[PDB]
Amino acid sequence: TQAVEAGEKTVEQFVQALNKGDYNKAAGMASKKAANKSALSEKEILEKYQNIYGAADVKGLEISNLKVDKKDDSTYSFSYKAKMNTSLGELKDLSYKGTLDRNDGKTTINWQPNLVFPEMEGNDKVSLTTQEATRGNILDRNGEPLATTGKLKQLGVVPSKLGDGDEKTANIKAIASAFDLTEDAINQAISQSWVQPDYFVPLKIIDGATPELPAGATIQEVDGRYYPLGEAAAQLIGYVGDITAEDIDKNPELSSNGKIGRSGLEMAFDKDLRGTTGGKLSITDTDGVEKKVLIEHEVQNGKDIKLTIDAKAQKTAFDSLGGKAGSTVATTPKTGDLLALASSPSYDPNKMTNGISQEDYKAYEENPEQPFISRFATGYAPGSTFKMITAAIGLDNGTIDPNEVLTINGLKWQKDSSWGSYQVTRVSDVSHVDLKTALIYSDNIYMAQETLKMGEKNFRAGLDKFIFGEDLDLPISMNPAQISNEESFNSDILLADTGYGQGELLINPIQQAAMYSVFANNGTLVYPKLIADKETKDKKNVIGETAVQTIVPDLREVVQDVNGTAHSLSALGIPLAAKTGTAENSFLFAFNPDNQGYMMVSMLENKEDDDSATKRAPELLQYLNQNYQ
Amino acid sequence: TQAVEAGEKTVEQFVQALNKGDYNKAAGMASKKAANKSALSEKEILEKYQNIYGAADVKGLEISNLKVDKKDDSTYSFSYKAKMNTSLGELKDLSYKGTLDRNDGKTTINWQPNLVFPEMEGNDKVSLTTQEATRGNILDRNGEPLATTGKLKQLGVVDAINQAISQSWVQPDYFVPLKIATIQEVDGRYYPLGEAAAQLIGYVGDITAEDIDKNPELSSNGKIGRSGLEMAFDKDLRGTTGGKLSITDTDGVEKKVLIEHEVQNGKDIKLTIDAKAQKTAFDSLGGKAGSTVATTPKTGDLLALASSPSYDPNKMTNGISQEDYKAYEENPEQPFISRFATGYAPGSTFKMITAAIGLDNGTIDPNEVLTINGLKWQKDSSWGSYQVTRVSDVSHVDLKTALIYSDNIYMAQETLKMGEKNFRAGLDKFIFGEDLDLPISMNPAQISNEESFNSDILLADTGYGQGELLINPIQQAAMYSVFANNGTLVYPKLIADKETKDKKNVIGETAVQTIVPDLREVVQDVNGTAHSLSALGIPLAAKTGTAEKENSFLFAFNPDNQGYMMVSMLENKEDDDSATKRAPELLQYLNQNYQ
Amino acid sequence: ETQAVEAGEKTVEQFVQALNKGDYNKAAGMASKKAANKSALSEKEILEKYQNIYGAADVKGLEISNLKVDKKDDSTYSFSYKAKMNTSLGELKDLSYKGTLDRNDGKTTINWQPNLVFPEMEGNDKVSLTTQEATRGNILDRNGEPLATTGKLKQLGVVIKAIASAFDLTEDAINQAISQSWVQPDYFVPLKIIATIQEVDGRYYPLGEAAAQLIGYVGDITAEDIDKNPELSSNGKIGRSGLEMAFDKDLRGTTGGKLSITDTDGVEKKVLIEHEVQNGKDIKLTIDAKAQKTAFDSLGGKAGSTVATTPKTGDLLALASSPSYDPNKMTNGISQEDYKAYEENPEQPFISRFATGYAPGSTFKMITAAIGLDNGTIDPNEVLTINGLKWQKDSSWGSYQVTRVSDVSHVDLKTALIYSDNIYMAQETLKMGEKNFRAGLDKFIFGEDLDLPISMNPAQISNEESFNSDILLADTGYGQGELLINPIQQAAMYSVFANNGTLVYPKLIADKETKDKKNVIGETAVQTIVPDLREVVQDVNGTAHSLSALGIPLAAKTGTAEKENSFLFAFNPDNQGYMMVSMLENKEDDDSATKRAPELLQYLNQNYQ
């Protein structure tokens, strides 16, 4: 039994040449072609493996229970169990068996087609099919689609069925108008390197708007990814891209023909949404008639994802910013439900996914207001809106007497002359200011002073009860909120600018909504929620019931009182508590203090002359007030 | 200069390393990474080519109009035109440009992303999509489908119930397909007439790796015609795959399309087959071995091509049990054979051909009566044991009587009376030796093996449809059409749009006006061999036939309107079974619908 | 009400407003002439009185109230107001000014007197303004030993061979020092802290580089620092990093000062402001200075990190980082040569490696296994069969293979911990899947910020709310992937093994109270894995078997993250008295955290029970 173990080594070498895909080395180990030896020549054996093992991406072949036993002086029979990896899964418990040829202490394999797959015979062959999966939808709280995959009415033109110089130039005129698109863009489209004369050339995607078509112009139906709210939810939802080689490197389970999320929720949930590809590996006879199924995995289409977003609230919130720089966030404060996450400016995510001209694309990329940013997750100084936090702490720790009246003269202030030229400024020269007056007029000086009276140690003990430094259990990329660029202020100037929402504070609009929810839950903080089925999470006693019952009445008066900063909202006739804000940027906070049915946080970045968040809030506040009670 | 041609060599070697897919060698010719040198490390470059040139299967890169000039001391610029092959087509007149770094005599390439494709930049990428085509249908003369691709109700579960749930791949909660408690809707190829048109239409199989070797323009996910017409027209039916090669930014947003070939779905193929005639024709063969062909003889239109037994093409294409498959393969009556294209002896039916030849050249007088005794006959005793046999012992026998009773002996005697040379001059006006312009594989029809009969016995057996004649059922329909066209022969037609082709004066107008009346009498007259068809009440001309196990034949057509013709054959008949006994249901169909 | 009264009111208010703007010349022009019944000084002498006095105290922000203006006779009106003002030492409140005005043909002027500088001043009275700098507080270890202190440093110097070889310098440095621009022949030249030596007050860090990154260092105060914070004195030191900067306000104290009115000889007559100096507070840490010095030296100057705690309370006993810098030269004098060394060194000694996020490496397997066992996916006894050193789910994974180092065929959980079997865990993770994996990972402290005075990013599981790959799911199960946990965060997560599944948050301030997070992993997962963690040591094939020579009760797990990062986790399973997490970054050939762990494990074992 040295010949026996020489036969064992011969099997193992064959198998290892296969694992390295060295199909030529393995074919070199076969006996000559003969009725009693190998069934094919060496090249005929090389080809079978390249075709079948190449096609199925066979590797990771592991044999077990190897047995080699003598039949006659020049013939040894062998048998082993094997597992192998294919590109569709793992094949487990294959029973291979064959014979070996001993001829002058040289041992080869009597190759037979049943050393590709156990049951194969003669001219049998192997087929490998895949069924790609269809991408799941993204839905709002009421099932309305925000990202959906389906048929799309696409527009295009044929260059030949268009004319010459006479009609080619006026049909361009004709189809350019019917569909609101450049007459020049039609000239650059028809003249790209790829455009043969008799091709279909794509121009636009359309939605229940197919007019009587000019001549040359034909529309065809395309499967595509579609975003019904377009740019109104583009930063939240994201867009999907073509799959590349680089994507398949980083993840070779993807197929070249899919789509892949590149930003927003499309990327955050790409595995759930993309599904799993179906596939089948079969042994067939010489005509492709299946004789044995080796692997069969049914396609699983992608899962639907349901959000808390209200598509109407979303559209309205985004339009109300009129294309200026800014962001709006709205919630149902007692549960966390995020009803709208708007950011302005924005981009047309339907073009990024289905085709965008080099012109429209360079528009977006260079625009200095930066439409690809998710401003509702960008950190900002919250602004003087923040004063209601400082005040809530003040009252909690005893520092602030609601009735203590301060006397303040002018618009500038400093603790003493040691602050040099740094002065807290305010906008309204009120002399006698208690808490109520300070919220109503947005009095930074009042708050600067009550902070310095309270001290770093007491402020941070209150601030610390919120969610600074945390990461929020949400599928949106965001840095946590900081108090300052370090672990302590080491200035009274900074301690004080921070008491009125400036300084080195960074809180993004989603985080602000979370902090301010205390005013709608008796001091308990309720965490923002974006996936509809998730459970509500809270943090109790963040501030006290009595700070809230003191501050909310003063926040109603920011609206009702004629000197309130948000008194333009009293015309609406709806119950509002609010605080306005500015940082050095315009801010608005508001919620319904009668039913706590809704809360919103709106921001206008680099406000234009006399523009403000407060001027843009009415249409959304009317909507939210009516539908969330 | 030495340094300029040093640069030309480096370009030519870089490009030649790319063709050879030797991407490691090519990145090894690059300069160090630097703002005025190469933009990436050696392995970032090895990977970029592997990803992109590997993905698109770039090969066959051919450069032309190479130019190399010195720009400054340490840097030489190059430019060339190129074309290259991708898996989607050929890229033509790409304009490449770059620079080289000569540092102490050594020439490296200042690699930049525009040495993959001219237009690339920075972290740009490449996407490559395909759209596979939908296979066209095969349609009957009325647009009804004989082969169609669509949705199918696929029964399954999450005897054969037990062998299914227990195959290697069947894990617990999988859907396991049964045949066409849970149903799912799946795309597949489907044959509405099932086995009744199987040998004509064919069936399709999974595409295999072996198929992609012989034709790598195919996709792994298609189906492929394996026999019959599915295979004859596989290219027209399968269409062409769509494809797109794009340069994209780092997020997959398209910036330039290099190639776009739009999908072309497969063409429909429209036949002359009448699906109802085909089902009836096949059903009437009662599962026996045999064949039916029906035509509209004045145009050639092939209304039906039946062969029995047959097989279930829906099982070969979507799933067949190990038992059912071995049944078909081991069955000795051979269901996979297309009997309507197989050559056979035409049998005593053929006499109406001989008789027509006789009347054209003068050998046969319609009224001359022969005298015949018994059921056997031979020229003289030099024939050993070979006797022309007949079934009916009629004494006096002219031509009409001979067609009516199927009198082999009469036709033998008139054949010898005509002789090989005059017999062959008539036969040679037909379609022996021709190939018919039809998408069915078939051997041309022969008269005998060698160009003479070389026996008198064989000359006589040929006069009554035996011997070494080989005519497949379509070829018979073609020859026998002379009796519905005043002597003109009309070639069969199977593609509905093709034009009719005829061959005039194959037999004479008078042979036809003499024989057809006699063929009406094969039906009406009570001693006629096809009397059982008078029961139906339709205008028929017919001739019955036998060849020797024995094979039964029927030819028939409507002599009032020439609307239809049929040729039916029962291979190795059972006792008292016959083609004529099986023909009524199709004659009823044809008579009503073809006028 | 009268125009003459309200003209007098406005004449006062403008006088005050000119002073507020430091427009002292404008204000003296509103004075009456110099006379026994008008002003006491000329317009020039008055301008100078304000420049001296109001200039010295940086008077500004003067606010009056209760203004009263009354007729005395036709040309004389008396006035009075209360005032508050800002000085450089604070705010003066309830000042009572009084004087008279001169009406002379529609023109109203001020009959100036010295008591319109400060209420009580008279004649040639003057003003004094003194300050007292505070002395900086200490930073202390758990036993009161100083980590940062202010005191007297034996600075050595010269007014060359015999004094370069006694205290040990480069005789070159003695030539470059004496020959600098400022060195007059008769000056003292500072050379070293420990030829004449004198006693100097200085900031001193006794552990030097062993704690440089935690404690930080202090710098000169510059003009720019006082802009950003003009409550600083020109003469202090200021923390530039570490706790020196994190706690600089508490450490620096409050400067004392006194504002006084004096007679012309400096005899104090009225004290306006007096704030007594407040020296800085001491800050007391959980650090153990011996543990810190030992932990840092055991890293032999290589890149790496040691973190040690008492897991049942969070106390951080050591936070060492290597390589490091000499904070004593940064604070008291450093050659341009040594300074360029630090800033250009590529191993980055100024980084706080104990607060840097890293992939935790294969040590992480014990977290996965705990989750695996809590949710049922993993049966401690189920044996998997694994062949070779590489593995992948199927061929759709391309070139990504989980690799391991020891080719064991049969492999249950115990065995997988003992040999560090990456493949066993890859499989057991895929078997439980992202949703079950993350339900465990989420009960820990990903995303949280730790209530600590050290700047650090929170720990992530991956970059998005999901992996979007099976491959990444698997690399994460054995501590690779997109995991980021810094050594302190590692110590906090691994504490579950010393508290029966309850997680105890790190503490660096000694008096702060302990905070935990209960039922993070299960009591039975802990009782299953610790026995396997003793054998990573005791068993001869365990990856840490070289520590059984020490003779101490250990549970441990080793780790690798692939350059090559070496990891050791270890603690006492009998008394839970101490835990350590050490990391050797970019290991050399055959070096590892485990080989460098013995002297710290000996100290900790005996001192923390």
PDB file of C-alpha atoms in Angstrom, chain B residues 345-460:
ATOM      1  CA  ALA B 345     -42.567   3.994 -50.458  1.00  0.00           C
ATOM      2  CA  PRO B 346     -45.764   5.805 -51.522  1.00  0.00           C
ATOM      3  CA  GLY B 347     -47.735   2.622 -52.006  1.00  0.00           C
ATOM      4  CA  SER B 348     -50.403   1.668 -54.541  1.00  0.00           C
ATOM      5  CA  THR B 349     -51.631   5.252 -54.391  1.00  0.00           C
ATOM      6  CA  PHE B 350     -48.752   5.960 -56.710  1.00  0.00           C
ATOM      7  CA  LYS B 351     -50.641   4.233 -59.534  1.00  0.00           C
ATOM      8  CA  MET B 352     -52.486   7.430 -60.334  1.00  0.00           C
ATOM      9  CA  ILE B 353     -49.094   8.890 -61.237  1.00  0.00           C
ATOM     10  CA  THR B 354     -48.134   5.974 -63.526  1.00  0.00           C
ATOM     11  CA  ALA B 355     -51.582   5.998 -65.061  1.00  0.00           C
ATOM     12  CA  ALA B 356     -51.158   9.700 -65.842  1.00  0.00           C
ATOM     13  CA  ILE B 357     -47.774   9.067 -67.452  1.00  0.00           C
ATOM     14  CA  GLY B 358     -49.210   6.278 -69.599  1.00  0.00           C
ATOM     15  CA  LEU B 359     -52.037   8.517 -70.857  1.00  0.00           C
ATOM     16  CA  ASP B 360     -49.644  11.351 -71.712  1.00  0.00           C
ATOM     17  CA  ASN B 361     -47.245   9.218 -73.862  1.00  0.00           C
ATOM     18  CA  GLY B 362     -49.877   6.872 -75.416  1.00  0.00           C
ATOM     19  CA  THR B 363     -49.097   3.538 -73.706  1.00  0.00           C
ATOM     20  CA  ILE B 364     -52.439   3.453 -71.825  1.00  0.00           C
ATOM     21  CA  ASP B 365     -55.845   3.472 -73.567  1.00  0.00           C
ATOM     22  CA  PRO B 366     -58.601   4.214 -71.014  1.00  0.00           C
ATOM     23  CA  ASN B 367     -60.920   1.707 -72.704  1.00  0.00           C
ATOM     24  CA  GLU B 368     -58.515  -1.079 -73.629  1.00  0.00           C
ATOM     25  CA  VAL B 369     -59.514  -3.954 -71.315  1.00  0.00           C
ATOM     26  CA  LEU B 370     -56.995  -6.435 -69.914  1.00  0.00           C
ATOM     27  CA  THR B 371     -57.867  -9.940 -68.749  1.00  0.00           C
ATOM     28  CA  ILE B 372     -56.579 -11.068 -65.361  1.00  0.00           C
ATOM     29  CA  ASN B 373     -57.136 -14.298 -63.449  1.00  0.00           C
ATOM     30  CA  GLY B 374     -56.557 -14.864 -59.761  1.00  0.00           C
ATOM     31  CA  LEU B 375     -54.804 -12.642 -57.251  1.00  0.00           C
ATOM     32  CA  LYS B 376     -51.261 -13.264 -58.557  1.00  0.00           C
ATOM     33  CA  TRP B 377     -49.434 -12.526 -61.799  1.00  0.00           C
ATOM     34  CA  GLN B 378     -45.944 -12.498 -63.268  1.00  0.00           C
ATOM     35  CA  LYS B 379     -44.480 -11.775 -66.705  1.00  0.00           C
ATOM     36  CA  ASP B 380     -43.185 -15.375 -67.085  1.00  0.00           C
ATOM     37  CA  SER B 381     -41.518 -18.017 -64.895  1.00  0.00           C
ATOM     38  CA  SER B 382     -38.130 -16.310 -65.188  1.00  0.00           C
ATOM     39  CA  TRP B 383     -39.482 -14.174 -62.280  1.00  0.00           C
ATOM     40  CA  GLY B 384     -39.035 -17.016 -59.710  1.00  0.00           C
ATOM     41  CA  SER B 385     -41.444 -16.294 -56.876  1.00  0.00           C
ATOM     42  CA  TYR B 386     -42.131 -12.577 -57.430  1.00  0.00           C
ATOM     43  CA  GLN B 387     -45.786 -12.038 -58.223  1.00  0.00           C
ATOM     44  CA  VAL B 388     -47.681  -8.812 -58.400  1.00  0.00           C
ATOM     45  CA  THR B 389     -50.539  -9.440 -55.951  1.00  0.00           C
ATOM     46  CA  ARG B 390     -54.041  -7.979 -55.801  1.00  0.00           C
ATOM     47  CA  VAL B 391     -56.965  -8.381 -53.396  1.00  0.00           C
ATOM     48  CA  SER B 392     -59.965  -8.511 -55.714  1.00  0.00           C
ATOM     49  CA  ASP B 393     -60.315 -11.231 -58.408  1.00  0.00           C
ATOM     50  CA  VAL B 394     -61.988  -9.163 -61.094  1.00  0.00           C
ATOM     51  CA  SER B 395     -61.717 -10.666 -64.532  1.00  0.00           C
ATOM     52  CA  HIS B 396     -62.097  -7.761 -66.889  1.00  0.00           C
ATOM     53  CA  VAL B 397     -60.280  -4.588 -66.166  1.00  0.00           C
ATOM     54  CA  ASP B 398     -59.882  -1.273 -67.896  1.00  0.00           C
ATOM     55  CA  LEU B 399     -58.262   1.797 -66.319  1.00  0.00           C
ATOM     56  CA  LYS B 400     -61.272   3.050 -64.344  1.00  0.00           C
ATOM     57  CA  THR B 401     -61.881  -0.437 -62.887  1.00  0.00           C
ATOM     58  CA  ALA B 402     -58.247  -0.569 -61.847  1.00  0.00           C
ATOM     59  CA  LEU B 403     -58.321   2.660 -59.820  1.00  0.00           C
ATOM     60  CA  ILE B 404     -61.637   1.639 -58.263  1.00  0.00           C
ATOM     61  CA  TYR B 405     -60.431  -1.786 -57.000  1.00  0.00           C
ATOM     62  CA  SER B 406     -56.688  -0.942 -56.580  1.00  0.00           C
ATOM     63  CA  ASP B 407     -55.502  -3.467 -59.141  1.00  0.00           C
ATOM     64  CA  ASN B 408     -51.710  -3.760 -58.809  1.00  0.00           C
ATOM     65  CA  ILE B 409     -51.493  -6.363 -61.620  1.00  0.00           C
ATOM     66  CA  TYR B 410     -53.113  -4.089 -64.204  1.00  0.00           C
ATOM     67  CA  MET B 411     -50.649  -1.307 -63.392  1.00  0.00           C
ATOM     68  CA  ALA B 412     -47.638  -3.644 -63.413  1.00  0.00           C
ATOM     69  CA  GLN B 413     -48.592  -4.874 -66.911  1.00  0.00           C
ATOM     70  CA  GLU B 414     -49.110  -1.366 -68.288  1.00  0.00           C
ATOM     71  CA  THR B 415     -45.748  -0.351 -66.763  1.00  0.00           C
ATOM     72  CA  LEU B 416     -43.719  -3.080 -68.498  1.00  0.00           C
ATOM     73  CA  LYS B 417     -45.757  -2.166 -71.583  1.00  0.00           C
ATOM     74  CA  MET B 418     -44.440   1.410 -71.330  1.00  0.00           C
ATOM     75  CA  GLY B 419     -40.829   0.478 -70.473  1.00  0.00           C
ATOM     76  CA  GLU B 420     -38.154   2.116 -68.313  1.00  0.00           C
ATOM     77  CA  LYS B 421     -37.355   4.886 -70.842  1.00  0.00           C
ATOM     78  CA  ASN B 422     -40.934   6.204 -71.281  1.00  0.00           C
ATOM     79  CA  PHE B 423     -41.798   5.717 -67.589  1.00  0.00           C
ATOM     80  CA  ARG B 424     -38.768   7.729 -66.535  1.00  0.00           C
ATOM     81  CA  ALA B 425     -39.488  10.560 -69.006  1.00  0.00           C
ATOM     82  CA  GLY B 426     -42.754  11.201 -67.127  1.00  0.00           C
ATOM     83  CA  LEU B 427     -41.283  10.774 -63.654  1.00  0.00           C
ATOM     84  CA  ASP B 428     -38.471  13.117 -64.552  1.00  0.00           C
ATOM     85  CA  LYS B 429     -40.924  15.987 -65.051  1.00  0.00           C
ATOM     86  CA  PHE B 430     -41.781  15.886 -61.274  1.00  0.00           C
ATOM     87  CA  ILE B 431     -39.542  16.826 -58.317  1.00  0.00           C
ATOM     88  CA  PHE B 432     -37.303  13.815 -57.845  1.00  0.00           C
ATOM     89  CA  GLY B 433     -33.822  14.942 -56.862  1.00  0.00           C
ATOM     90  CA  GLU B 434     -34.904  18.570 -56.088  1.00  0.00           C
ATOM     91  CA  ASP B 435     -34.707  20.072 -52.623  1.00  0.00           C
ATOM     92  CA  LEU B 436     -37.816  21.912 -51.597  1.00  0.00           C
ATOM     93  CA  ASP B 437     -37.340  25.467 -50.403  1.00  0.00           C
ATOM     94  CA  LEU B 438     -38.704  24.673 -46.899  1.00  0.00           C
ATOM     95  CA  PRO B 439     -37.273  25.043 -43.394  1.00  0.00           C
ATOM     96  CA  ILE B 440     -37.563  21.316 -42.766  1.00  0.00           C
ATOM     97  CA  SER B 441     -34.610  18.935 -43.023  1.00  0.00           C
ATOM     98  CA  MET B 442     -35.391  16.305 -45.664  1.00  0.00           C
ATOM     99  CA  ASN B 443     -33.596  14.219 -48.358  1.00  0.00           C
ATOM    100  CA  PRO B 444     -34.797  14.720 -51.952  1.00  0.00           C
ATOM    101  CA  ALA B 445     -37.115  12.154 -53.454  1.00  0.00           C
ATOM    102  CA  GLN B 446     -35.595   9.271 -55.440  1.00  0.00           C
ATOM    103  CA  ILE B 447     -36.999   6.869 -58.039  1.00  0.00           C
ATOM    104  CA  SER B 448     -34.538   4.032 -57.410  1.00  0.00           C
ATOM    105  CA  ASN B 449     -31.050   3.620 -55.968  1.00  0.00           C
ATOM    106  CA  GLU B 450     -29.056   3.612 -59.192  1.00  0.00           C
ATOM    107  CA  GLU B 451     -30.041   5.471 -62.376  1.00  0.00           C
ATOM    108  CA  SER B 452     -31.522   2.351 -63.993  1.00  0.00           C
ATOM    109  CA  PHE B 453     -33.791  -0.160 -62.291  1.00  0.00           C
ATOM    110  CA  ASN B 454     -31.645  -3.007 -63.540  1.00  0.00           C
ATOM    111  CA  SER B 455     -34.567  -5.446 -63.206  1.00  0.00           C
ATOM    112  CA  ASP B 456     -37.935  -5.862 -64.894  1.00  0.00           C
ATOM    113  CA  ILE B 457     -39.411  -6.903 -61.561  1.00  0.00           C
ATOM    114  CA  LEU B 458     -38.351  -3.632 -60.003  1.00  0.00           C
ATOM    115  CA  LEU B 459     -39.715  -1.632 -62.972  1.00  0.00           C
ATOM    116  CA  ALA B 460     -43.127  -3.221 -62.323  1.00  0.00           C
TER     117      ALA B 460
END
